[model samples]
Target chain A: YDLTQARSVSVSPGQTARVTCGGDNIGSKSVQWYQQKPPQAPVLVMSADDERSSGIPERFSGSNSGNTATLTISGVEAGDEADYYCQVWDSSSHHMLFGGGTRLTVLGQPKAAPSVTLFPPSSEELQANKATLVCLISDFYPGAVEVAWKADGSAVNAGVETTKPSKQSNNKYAASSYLSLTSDQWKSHKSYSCQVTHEGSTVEKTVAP
Target chain B: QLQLQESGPGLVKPSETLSLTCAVSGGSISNNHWSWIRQPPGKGLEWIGLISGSGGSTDYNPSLKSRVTISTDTSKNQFSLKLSSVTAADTAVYYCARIDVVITSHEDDFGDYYTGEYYGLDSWGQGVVVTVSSASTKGPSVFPLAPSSRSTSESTAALGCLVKDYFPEPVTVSWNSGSLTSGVHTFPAVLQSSGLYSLSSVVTVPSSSLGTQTYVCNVNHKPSNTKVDKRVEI
Candidate 1:
């Protein structure tokens, strides 16, 4: 008999967020809305009052008037920073409650967009002259961002290495950066770049030879 | 490769009757689908029912469906939970999941109509906290641990609550509510040369009460008057 959430709800993108859900003796219970996304495992968005479950999507919506229950999400995108729970069904003690999760946060304007990809440095590491390149920052989200490395365009840091931002299961946020060119800068085809500073825009991806 | 593990009694008293047992390993407990989720101490999460691997089909949670009971032995593949009239809100942590069912089929015209649900939680089982608290904490002939908490935030946002492995020693860590609680540190219960006992209790609320209040973490085990609680959020 517990399910409360009176915090964490920063919506943005298309705007619209309301996740309140309280319960004590929630008698006529029937509310439901589960959409957790982090390492995945939770799906069933909408069930009683607003009913929208077969294939979900209608911006996600749900509501129940009495003991309070709600889960609305119009437009808010960037895969809607999930973690929403509010499922009750206390059919007079048939117990099946949940709620203690409400982390919608979709407000990170620069669009967590980062699908950059590049991978060159094989052929025995460019014939051993050492050339490591790989910059794959898939998806991406409020996982704090900033990954840079350049070669033909300047700014380079000896053997750069960037790897702490791994969280993808749709909750977005993945990272990988490594560049150490120099086989005469890999047969001289040069042109490296890998920039990807989220939340202030910046997503580059160049590679050659 | 399914793997669940939740043995029994950590301590129970109130009305008595809370047997647990989920010792699965590897595969077939029948085939698939098995559940029993709980989490109370502060509150949130509780499904308490599920068992379908063929005919042994069962489902509960209708308010404990008259004193719950989810069975399954599939020749020892294991699966059990029998809660009957125990109180302290059935202290929880119990978890033994693996339910990824989703059979579909719906043909209107009055023909096909098949629907087998249960959509997530494919693997889980690293939980076991049950406690009914009429008190009972002196069962260490060699160490009987069963209290857990994991929190982190140091640089002034201090909010640590690491009260783990238990067995003996003044351990009373509180923070049930008290004006945004401030500096309540208690880090002096260490006697772990295999004797049992480990402590780390910190409280310095106000990062907006972590999640708007209720950062509960009450644990008092003086010899055997046991009392345990753990919660972190909304």
Candidate 2:
């Protein structure tokens, strides 16, 4: 039987898009969504299909009807295309994975969104003046509108900064920014961001100490 | 028949994680623990996590490393799922299974999908999908993998099938469409590296609209009831 672990579509940054996939006999199962950066790997921008994660870009998302699932991106980016998969957890198998890889194609200007930081986030300790700062984001989504950073415009480099998200009472998605910037970045430009967004709403806050 | 459905956006951009939820129907969400799982094309499967209706609590799969969460809503009979740190490897079929934890090991086999040996799941809900990245070659979305192979009848049929999860245990496929058997059509099976299991029991029915009844493609492994007289209709 064809196992519908997932379904998807991808496009370049400046064009409309459509990608779809589904399954049969997969009852009580869900079709998940993902975004691949080609040879590198794919990231999950949506979970179970719709509950947007903290930091998901406003432009990308998913949907489904019966067994058919769809991925619609009104505006594509060059970086958008990559491989994608439809996957599910087979209790029989104690692991997480996808159906097969779906190749993503990015055309033209491709206003590609920032790639989702796969974990354990890009961790590295950097020394600034007489201080040290670490960037890390354990759990997050989109990698676009949502991101962690230092006021100077340097990415928070997830590993050292470690921006862990907050959980909400509902099962959907709720996250936050985290960091342990050295005494310098914390004192000089302590402003940080814990951005989030969905199709109809966006929540991004710049924080400071 | 009360059915549950999950709805949400499909594709996410590069470097973004996707999340979604399920809307349950036909029952009370206040009673049990619902689970989350995902499967990639041609791959086996992965266990995400589960949330208890009692307090909205959850325990996720550790193998996923640093990405996973499950949530639910009793008032709306709905639950949600989320995955992060995704890459192309993250593409797959996501599902919500009905996991039952009994105080006793004997009770773990609640659902029939487990033959006589059960792991405590009694039922399952219809799943949903959330595609990340746009599928595009020109504009700006993540396009699907290379164009599929040249199309054909046999090829299309094969493509239509969900390609069983990779299961690698000794197994068998069975059917209960008119072909009578002396006893339970039991078949021990194996699991594939990809997680797909080679197991199924299609039970067809004699109806005008569905004379060519196709549901037999799937099977029912009920734990409590075990008689070959299988004529169950809702």
Candidate 3:
């Protein structure tokens, strides 16, 4: 059966939160829950009814009704901030079905928008007939953003590579995108821009050749 | 150069069976798995079923397993798909592909271990469109619920807004209050038994602004020019 889940859930520390997984025949099968922190593998938190893995907090639990299964987290903590996925074994299909995953947001943490700075290609790189422009996005919260590069006001997709947001010591995130171009192609464009979209807001930085 | 071509009827009546065949050429069908994938107009792709080249094994998407049957014809160098009790949601461009399988073996502490890894669909058929006729369309009926707080901490609080019972799918959800640059997520729409859709979005905010701040959930259905707002406060 097809499994579905909420896109996200948020809660304050010490509060109880519930995320649901909906599908057909959910009540007839055992449900398992996994916690995945980005850059790491998924950890099985709960499985079958309400069984928790070793060392898992007692606050995490699972239950099912009708065609839905629910994962309830009591006394949520900041460390609990991660994506949760529910899985079930489909007997008819003889395979495991997983939900789209739900992101758990722990409130009370500091949030910040990304500071974008675009750097033009260096002269030394131009001497080699190649140019690389860099867009440095720093200090963003939640570690997610859409990065786009433009040349002379139009968007360009080729030769652009963006790095995943990396968590910093301060708990904020930092990421960068690079645009490669031939020296001739770079000189042909008067200006290049880097656009970072985060939290419904777009921050743009432009540089001249 | 391996190639595939899909052949099927263009029209099917609702509640009837839909059949399609994939003819393979330029390669041997042995030692490979044949698969059927489909995509509706303006929608994502869905895997229907797959059959071994020898037709001894088959696997299907659980959601469609009860209604789907896949088979292979080595003599004809092809495979086929038959789906019964079809609905408008099943109307799509059906395609067939070849899945390559690689077998490997190794020795472990206990015994010899062998595994088979399945790889890409290197060859695909030109899809054939099959439309399920006599199906009617309807717009979504917006029902935005007041935000509910799920906070126990004095520093921060979380709120959720649910929008249910809509149809023909595209909808936009946004929050009017709080810094939405982060900690805001909208869930994918779910199809219900009534042929409508439902989804929810949640946002996190500072607990200090709880009672004084007014949060509004704006549900926009562009096709019908429908806008719905649900306001909530602690």
Candidate 4:
């Protein structure tokens, strides 16, 4: 009937982080795991002994033995850094039990800000009445970044395609985003800016073509 | 991201009433579900009851249905629980939890006791403990008579706390047998249609509550500042 644990844990990226759940009769009850971010509701990630919820990556798993349940995250990443909680349906008691949450943190990663470059449409491609602008993002570590396009200081919504960041040699990553425009539309717009959001900072470059 | 906070009396007089409320913020208190759960110190949790935030749905634990009431106020964006005739056994750490409800209509949807709805608790607030004790506590208005053994055998003696002619419709009944502090088996009071209330809670005494043995029935009704405690030895 008592559940308690450490306040938090710090693990490096690509390593494994384990959260432990212990209490009376814990082994007899079916255990479930959840991920809770600050100011957000808890999300079910693992359930029924060891079944992972749909859309939950294989990296998250759960196991129970004796009177303790364990939640492990393999190949942990920055995105996995959040508070983890354990729940059990106590059939004997006819009640749901929740374990005090443990915070999981990812350490040991240097912030490698992304470099951005914009390439304008070629003369031949412009003459065809169709043009495309490309923004190349490279050398970003921890891979997760946001790329967006703006025209004349207003956000561009249509004709934009962004790729998922891919790992490169030396552990860095690269990604690209493209914005399409008609010749007349491109000429009418005075300026276009490519904005890359990385690690809470924004890098942008504006060009008038 | 709704935030729920619980507030209530920290100390309640035994034989009286216990009340608590949950103040909700950061979201509207409509088209949603909320619930109250409590746990006695070092014991398992108990689902007190739940209500639809906007209104129109309600449920309670069958064990407490006789003495517990659950309601909500849309104007204040909050819900509340009122437990009558509480005793020391009622002391617990109460919590307010968010409930996810799925409403569906059934062909027999007109049933009074059954609502075609499903729900589960997803979030909980930190708990607040309410203790039942006071220096000036009194027994029930009409003191309980000596507990009588309804049934007796070599190994078990069925004891019943019989207290009648009480002002309140509900009364708190507790039994104490030697070494067995709190009997696991007990029942809430039943209203017998008369203005006065009568309560009968059953328990077992260890080869005692008779000659050379003692069992106590603590009947308390706080509103009248009453605490009528009596012991019986056969």
Candidate 5:
């Protein structure tokens, strides 16, 4: 009824890597594999029963046994780094179910921490009795991070919007979070902080009125 | 300098096939991937299908696989999408885009090692709007009933709404504010002999709050782009 996969996987170059999909009734149905890079639609890598789509490399293969389906990459490379998702048709629901994708990371490739920057509201916004704080997170690798906002050292949940990490032209990732506040609230607070958590490390940047 | 344009009929009747074409310009139609994506009104994008530039390979969304056909014409620099048995749910603004492929390689002691990385839709066509219409499709009529205390519990009360006579059976029901946990339930739509569907929803709340608070039931029928809100107060 549901499909589950690992959240992330890391492997060295030229090594064989495997990602598994676990679900009930998987063996009874054919499983397909798809590759997705950030900010783009997914591409079908393999059809049912190990059949590779056009132009897909021979290194990628798929198989199923019992209630699990597996995607094997024989020669992992830096270019092979992407999110992979497995899909299967559910006969009872008459719908296609997809696994939460597993992010594949090539070990030799370096991981970079995000550069966190906080920008205060413009004077024009203050004139309008409203304030918008911008937290720009850039140059991060692996494209996963958690962003939080704090006002006067306390958590601020309302009026905060964070975008998903998007891939940059340099292959690193970037994201932005916006915090909305009234001009009165912005003036009263001592400082606003933008905290980014990436790969077990947290970086904080603050801006004052 | 690659540009794309989508051309298709603006209207399609239910139970018939919808066909659209994407014309490629300012670039060669070979060695790339072409795709068809669509978004229903006020809905998210859905990937319909993809075709190799050479016209040899194709892949479709499994939900639409049985009803989809994607083909390419190398000579005409265009690709076509044919989806059959479309209902109101299939009405969408269809777009065509180009998939950019990046092949990374380096010479090693053994042999040439290369891996392909495909990026998202880099080039997109101006989308074409296609509406699925038919005389039989109708929006639901919503009726919000009064709240009454449940016999089993004095602390709780129930409020319900009847959504009746909608064609193309997909409708969403929700309350304006409530803990939807186990307190809210919507029955499945029942098909009438007259070829229409009807359903009902109930929300249970604390009886003490009945007079002090108000509840609104919202029903959305996408086929007719109709939204009905019924407010109840005791």
Candidate 6:
């Protein structure tokens, strides 16, 4: 593994490593990190860097270092093994980019969702006739197991919407979710939601409406 | 037209965890997507995941895809990103960007995982890469580790966790990895005077974790329900 002004950098077992992922013409929408382990599966560490991943250990911290980004896995152990990577885009070009992953070899142990639902209308209602309920995920991806719903737990209706798919994540393809509600309650509602079905599973969210 | 700039550490080791923050300048983190994306050296790219500047959405990438996350702090007008389970292949550039967001719901008949949700990178910060190396710091920087066990036992260890804070109700903490603990609940974790939220997560690996098992953390994030991280943001 080599990194010298290269796109991706390499990390050794039991040490700290960092990389900067960006490029010309890449649309600056959202940045992310990824990992890969030989003959093993990759995991989502800190999805909400500001907010730890749903089930990640605490010691793992991620920060931006000038033009170089960083990931610090405190207490590096043996099982702390895998390849690390970063991702971003050029707002000007919409070009997606990724850095090589940092490989970690741990001699120890460690480890790491949800389901769907229906709509229950808005959190607040003036007279039932003037209410609004929704589930807005905004954007969604492919290969998911369950679909999310509105925060208030509304039933999913049927309709035609737009879906953007990208073969970026492991070439599995990416997509976004966008659902809108029109209950009068929306005037004073809490959130919206979007639902999906995967293997008879469901996940919902009362998106920021 | 809001923007975010990630700030923090630059380099990390193989078994050590990585950390970073994105200072959002200009605009309101009210209804936009704050996301983390990365690129491996000479590789195309992938979506690690992202948090909504709006605080309504919090999503993560799949395990085999990579480990990554995006968070926000409306008070400082900033957000952050994190990744784990890094390795050599995890080497790449990391960045913070914004997503043009659209809220959908059942009243709107939108699927939880919409098939047609798209976001463009409006702004991005300079990137940093954490390398996987065998280096030594003071005593020894410890990171969570595990084997790539295919069976459920592979997840024998609890996630490396830490609870930075909790702003309020909309901002609560849970221990999906065991029984999550509640630590510091100040500054970074409050609905600042400006009515925005912010904070960090608690990360951890077993005290005696073996660094080979594939450990993972999946955030039920919305807005940018994007998955696939390189130990996430390498």
Enumerate residue pairs that collide in model 4: B15-B222, B138-B226, B138-B227, B139-B226, B139-B227, B139-B228, B140-B226, B140-B227, B140-B228, B210-B234
Which segments of model 6 are wrong by more than 4 Å?
A1-209, B64-67, B105-116, B136-234
DockQ scores for all the models shown? 0.07, 0.04, 0.02, 0.01, 0.02, 0.03
Candidate 4 lDDT over A1-209, as tens digits, reads 65655678989999999999988767776777767553233566877668887789998888988878898899998788777877664434444556767888778768899976565565555777866665666779778899889999999987676666755434567776667688888998899999999989989976677
* Reference-based TM-score, model 6: 0.30
- TM-scores (chain A) of the candidates: 0.35, 0.41, 0.66, 0.52, 0.62, 0.38
Q: What would the per-residue lDDT of candidate 3 be over residues B1-234, giving only the tens digit for each residue?
A: 878888766567799999888888998676578888776654434567677786458878877859999887889888899999999998777878775555689999888897554433435675776778654434454332222233325465446454545545556788884335465655455554555555556566777776687777777764345687766434
What is candidate 3's CA lDDT for residue A170? 51
Full-model lDDT for every candidate: 0.64, 0.43, 0.70, 0.67, 0.74, 0.43
Q: Candidate 1 vs candidate 2: which has greater DockQ?
A: 1
Q: What is the DockQ of candidate 1?
A: 0.07
The complex in candidate 3 yields a DockQ of 0.02
lDDT at residue B96 of model 4 (Cα atoms): 84
Worst 10 residues of 2 chain A by lDDT: A115-124
- 2 or 6, greater by DockQ: 2
How do the residues A98-134 of candidate 2 rate in per-residue lDDT, one tens digit apiece?
A: 5554555554432322212111101121232222221
Badly placed stretches (over 4 Å) of model 3 are: A23-25, A38-40, A115-124, A142-209, B1-234
Cα error, candidate 1, residue B43 (Å)? 23
Candidate with best TM-score: 5
RMSD of 3: 20.2
lDDT of 6: 0.43
lDDT digits (tens) for residues A62-141 of candidate 5: 99888899999988987888888887654344344667778887786587999765556655557878676766677798
Per-residue lDDT value at B148 in model 4 = 23
Candidate 2 lDDT, B41-81, residue by residue in tens: 44444567777777785666766666776777767788887
lDDT of 3 by residue, A1-209 (tens): 68898888999999998989898868887787777564333456777757787788889988987899999999998788877878765655455466778888878877689976455555555787866666667779978999988999999867776666766545578777767689999999888899999999999987776
Output DockQ, candidate 6. 0.03
Candidate 6 local lDDT, A1-209, one digit each (tens): 11222343334456654444443322223445555542222444543222355566776776653354556677554445556665543334333345555544433222102222222223232243432221122112333433444445655443213233322222232333323334543544465566665446555433343
Off-target runs (Cα >4 Å) in candidate 4 are A1-209, B104-120, B135-234
TM-score of each: 0.30, 0.30, 0.40, 0.36, 0.43, 0.30
Overall local distance difference test of candidate 4: 0.67
Candidate 5, pairs of clashing residues: none
